[PDB]
């Protein structure tokens, strides 16, 4: 034994235990999700209200990269911010040289190679976040989810955090019941419901819902936060479904 | 101002039958001022002989450098360096200073100890090898030396005939150059004997 004391060490199984321990930090975090719709993507996250003293709507979790990509993550929040900062540098250098905004698959690999690089040495720690991200490019909508190992795939729907099992089951129903697809406005409503349903794993404290979206028709392919009336409409829809 | 003609001097080398000759004047000057009449420009490392004309500080520096390098060569190779090999070492060494060169005109002379073949070679300040069969010239009276050698030289001269030819080539070339002369030395080189002769010449 001792294989789990140092990053980048293969166990006799062929496993990197330090990466697996980073996953435990992700599983300990709040629930975040992503839904791929007809012409875009919708991101939503559970924000635990630890105290009444938290200013509502102020501690924003979802982050924009460039102007067309949204990023949300569960686990160690600072690690997620560090990853987004890198992503923003990657997107800037891509656009600088190639003019066009970074395509979502291209951006996915940039984050992927960076996270994977933190599993190659014992002088760094793996990322304590799973990141759900995506947006609209020239080939359409894309949704990705990226793990501490650097592993990522494309998704129809994605979920991570403490209530991921609940969320995944809900996402799987949507995929089965809508083979033709989901509209952006439908996806926002469904995202609100799934976070509310996934909040049962975090039922002790109450929470605040945060939603964002990129849609070719609804936002001109730009990342925007769901605010005001549209947000309240989604909250009402969600509250109606849990009762 | 021109570094290759501040100090003055000349070297000439010739091949003969189973022998080579290398010769130089003895003058070191500061332009018009004669400074030394004992500044020899021919050196040797084992059986390989090197003459160097041009800027005198570089002449001294390169001699010290090639002594340095041929001494390490011998310790590692367990044998004395040959004229062909040394020629490449001189070329390599000069070209490493391509954009800050030594202002010199080196001349190699010697006999390969295994084949017995006579060898001479010349270089520009930057390492370009001139491997002539007949003769190599260098220095502030190189034009004069080319003229003398072209008319006086004939192939397969015996050591003692080659001595006369190269001596007369040097002497009469040097007497038509203000910055050359003040004495002269001639090396006659055979496979296992080398004779060194200082010549009598005018001292102006």
């Amino acid at each position: 034994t001792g294989y789990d004391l140092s990053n980048s060490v293969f166990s006799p199984d062929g496993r990197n235990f330090q990466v697996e321990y980073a996953v435990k930090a992700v599983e300990n975090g709040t629930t975040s999700i992503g839904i791929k719709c007809n012409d875009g993507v919708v991101f939503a996250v559970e924000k635990l209200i630890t105290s009444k003293l938290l200013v509502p709507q102020k501690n924003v979790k979802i982050q924009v990269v460039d102007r067309h990509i949204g990023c949300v993550y569960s686990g160690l929040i600072p690690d997620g911010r560090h990853l987004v900062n890198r992503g923003r540098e990657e997107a800037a250098s891509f656009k600088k040289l190639y003019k066009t905004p970074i395509p979502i698959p291209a951006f996915a690999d940039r984050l992927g190679q960076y996270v994977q690089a933190h599993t190659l040495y014992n002088s760094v720690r793996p990322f304590g976040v799973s990141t759900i991200f995506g947006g609209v490019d020239k080939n359409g909508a894309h949704l990705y989810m990226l793990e501490p190992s650097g592993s990522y795939w494309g998704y129809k729907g994605a979920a991570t955090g403490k209530g991921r099992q609940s969320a995944k089951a809900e996402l799987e129903k949507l995929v089965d019941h809508h083979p033709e697809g989901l509209s952006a406005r439908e996806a926002v409503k469904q995202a609100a419901k799934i976070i509310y349903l996934a909040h049962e794993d975090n039922k002790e404290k109450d929470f605040e819902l945060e939603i964002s979206w990129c849609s070719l028709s609804e936002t001109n392919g730009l990342h925007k936060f769901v605010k005001g009336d549209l947000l309240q409409e989604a909250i009402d829809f969600a509250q109606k479904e849990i009762n | 101002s021109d570094p290759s003609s501040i100090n003055g001097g000349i070297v000439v080398a010739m091949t003969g039958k189973d022998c080579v000759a290398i010769a130089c004047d003895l003058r070191l000057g500061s332009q018009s001022l004669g400074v030394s009449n004992k500044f020899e420009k021919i050196f040797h490392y084992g059986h390989v002989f090197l003459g160097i004309t041009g800027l005198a500080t570089d002449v001294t520096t390169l001699n010290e450098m090639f002594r340095y390098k041929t001494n390490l060569y011998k310790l590692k190779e367990e044998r004395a360096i040959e004229p062909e090999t040394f020629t490449q070492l001189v070329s390599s060494s000069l070209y490493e200073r391509r954009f800050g060169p030594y202002f010199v005109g080196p001349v190699v002379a010697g006999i390969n100890s295994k084949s017995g073949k006579p060898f001479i070679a010349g270089f520009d300040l930057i390492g370009c090898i001139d491997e002539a069969k007949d003769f190599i010239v260098s220095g502030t009276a190189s034009d004069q030396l080319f003229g003398m050698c072209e008319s006086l030289y004939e192939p397969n001269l015996e050591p003692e005939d080659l001595f006369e030819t190269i001596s007369q080539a040097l002497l009469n070339a040097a007497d038509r150059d203000a910055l050359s002369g003040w004495g002269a030395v001639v090396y006659i080189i055979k496979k296992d004997e080398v004779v060194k002769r200082y010549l009598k010449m005018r001292q102006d």
Binding site: - | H44, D124, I126, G127, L152, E164, Q168, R197, Y198
Partner: protein, 228 residues
């Protein structure tokens, strides 16, 4: 005060390969330093290189790339290609912005076929069936433009190449002496024809200048110690 020789160098493509040729004069200013230098160089067994301009730079650059080509050939377990030598030469030369005054005709054969390129000191390259370089390039090109045709044989290409070199030899003061030729045919070993033509032989002198022994006045004799 570095050597920059006058030269005539040419390259001619033919049926089953390529031929290059050169004169054999090396100049120092108006003075002929070497009356029989070798301007045809090797890069690899079947890739050869004719050089003009700054003599030290042509030799140095041809040897460096030739060295890296040999290591590349051993690494890849493949015979070296002319385009590899071309690409390595031009990227080297371009990096130094023309301060390495090497002007080359590259020619050879490889698994891809037979090739003929020219490279300029600043790092530009050209392709052609017939090319010329050197102070006698215009004299040589005049001959090439007059007599070159498509589908030359081996013997015709050698004749055309050497005729182009001869035009330089006679009409250009920078070029002279002999004609070297190297033939690189596909499926065969490359044949280097040192002093293929020798039309400038020195005539018998009117008089022998062998001195009577003792003519030179001597001050000192001494035996030199070469042994350990």
């Amino acid at each position: 005060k570095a050597t920059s020789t006058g030269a005539t160098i040419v390259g001619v493509k033919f049926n089953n390969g390529v031929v290059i040729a050169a004169d054999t004069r090396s100049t120092q200013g108006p003075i002929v330093a070497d009356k029989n230098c070798a301007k045809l160089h090797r890069i690899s067994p079947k890739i050869w290189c004719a050089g003009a301009g700054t003599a030290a730079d042509t030799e140095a650059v041809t040897q460096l790339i030739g060295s890296n080509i040999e290591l590349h050939s051993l690494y890849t377990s493949r015979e070296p290609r002319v385009v590899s030598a071309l690409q390595m030469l031009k990227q080297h030369l371009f990096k130094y912005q023309g301060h390495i005054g090497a002007y080359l005709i590259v020619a050879g054969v490889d698994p891809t076929g037979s090739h003929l390129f020219s490279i300029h000191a600043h790092g530009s390259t050209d392709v052609g069936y017939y090319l010329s370089l050197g102070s006698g390039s215009l004299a040589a090109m005049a001959v090439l433009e007059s007599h070159w045709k498509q589908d030359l044989t081996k013997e015709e290409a050698i004749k055309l190449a050497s005729d182009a070199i001869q035009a330089g030899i006679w009409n250009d003061l920078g070029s002279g002496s002999n004609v070297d030729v190297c033939v690189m045919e596909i499926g065969k070993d490359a044949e280097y024809l040192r002093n293929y033509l020798t039309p400038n032989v020195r005539e018998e002198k009117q008089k022998s200048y062998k001195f009577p022994r003792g003519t030179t006045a001597v001050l000192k004799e001494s035996i030199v110690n070469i042994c350990d």
